[PDB]
Amino acid sequence: ETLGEKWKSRLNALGKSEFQIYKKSGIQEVDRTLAKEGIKRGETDHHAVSRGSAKLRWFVERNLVTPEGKVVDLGCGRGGWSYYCGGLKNVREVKGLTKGGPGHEEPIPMSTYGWNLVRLQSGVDVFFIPPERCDTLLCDIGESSPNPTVEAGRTLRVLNLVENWLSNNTQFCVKVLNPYMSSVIEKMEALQRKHGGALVRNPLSRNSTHEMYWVSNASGNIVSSVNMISRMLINRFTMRHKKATYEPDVDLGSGTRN
Numbered sequence: 001e002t003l004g005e006k007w008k009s010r011l012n013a014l015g016k017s018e019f020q021i022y023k024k025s026g027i028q029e030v031d032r033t034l035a036k037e038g039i040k041r042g043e044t045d046h047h048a049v050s051r052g053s054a055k056l057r058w059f060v061e062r063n064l065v066t067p068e069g070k071v072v073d074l075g076c077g078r079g080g081w082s083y084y085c086g087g088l089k090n091v092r093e094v095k096g097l098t099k100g101g102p103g104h105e106e107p108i109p110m111s112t113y114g115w116n117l118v119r120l121q122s123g124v125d126v127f128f129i130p131p132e133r134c135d136t137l138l139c140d141i142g143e144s145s146p147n148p149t150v151e152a153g154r155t156l157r158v159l160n161l162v163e164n165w166l167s168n169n170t171q172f173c174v175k176v177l178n179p180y181m182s183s184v185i186e187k188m189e190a191l192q193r194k195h196g197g198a199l200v201r202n203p204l205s206r207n208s209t210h211e212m213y214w215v216s217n218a219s220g221n222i223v224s225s226v227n228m229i230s231r232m233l234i235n236r237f238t239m240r241h242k243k244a245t246y247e248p249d250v251d252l253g254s255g256t257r258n
């Protein structure tokens with residue numbers, strides 16, 4: 001058994017209140033109140049549609065992914081990553097695809113900076129559509145489960161999916177819903193040998209998930225990067241400040257790009 005698995009049982013054993021307190025203990029949060037109120041009226045200018053943008057900004061503002069040219073965002077939901085890339089200096093084109101429909105988030109049309117570069121469709125199932133050429137691949141797909149084996153099945157589908165989309169020296173940031181299961185480690189190692197990058201933990205992630213993102217401009221041993229984060233999450237069980245710490249949202253400008 002891996003350390004991640006020990007962690008997952010310990011999580012599932014928690015009571016309802018302890019769960020909600022642990023989930024946000026000492027993590028990082030985004031001040032979203034005004035951005036949401038803005039959107040809940042007609043406002044289309046300045047706001048991120050999701051806390052997803054803040055999440056992507058963390059990776060980029062550090063040069064772990066450098067989106068550019070033709071960007072594909074698989075499972076883009078409301079559009080938080082897409083709209084975010086739409087205003088980055090080098091990015092030429094953003095295409096985003098999702099499920100939508102009853103029970104899922106629909107794309108939300110916005111006029112943030114570079115909105116014209118960005119094209120979103122719902123009703124799409126990414127697993128059965130032909131791969132297209134591109135320069136940067138993004139993917140935030142993975143529906144969590146109480147059962148880590150289910151999670152590994154779901155994650156290995158996402159991995160086989162992105163492989164088919166990956167070229168040569170293309171930029172990427174790909175959610176790995178479950179990185180600790182033995183079968184995922186293996187696929188990740190084979191994938192690292194063939195495309196590079198490594199796994200990195202985002203501090204905006206909640207303690208209730210062990211997700212790590214495969215980003216292109218990083219290195220590090222797969223096994224170590226993973227165990228590091230299991231030990232962290234276990235350390236966080238007995239924590240003694242028990243509060244999230246907030247940071248401002250992203251302003252995404254307004255207007256068309258060229």
Ligand SMILES: C[n+]1cn([C@@H]2O[C@H](COP(=O)(O)OP(=O)(O)OP(=O)(O)OC[C@H]3O[C@@H](n4cnc5c(N)ncnc54)[C@H](O)[C@@H]3O)[C@@H](O)[C@H]2O)c2nc(N)[nH]c(=O)c21
Nearest residue numbers: 008011012013014015016019020143144145146147208209
């Ligand atoms: C809501 N919840 C989720 N988790 C755990 O955290 C992981 C992700 O949980 P989440 O809050 O991020 O939920 P998710 O993003 O999937 O969306 P949603 O809240 O809609 O789904 C809740 C899922 O948690 C499961 N769940 C609900 N209550 C429990 C529980 N008491 N114990 C274990 N699993 C639970 C549900 O069956 C459901 O699949 C899950 O794999 C599960 O082990 C919980 N654990 C405890 N111990 N008590 C909980 O109340 C709880």
Ligand SMILES: Nc1ncnc2c1ncn2[C@@H]1O[C@H](CSCC[C@H](N)C(=O)O)[C@@H](O)[C@H]1O
Nearest residue numbers: 050052075076077080081098099125126140
């Ligand atoms: N098989 C599939 N094909 C297309 N979209 C899928 C999919 N499975 C899940 N998705 C969608 O992908 C989305 C990932 S969550 C979107 C978060 C986004 N990065 C943001 O910043 O807002 C979910 O809304 C889900 O409905």
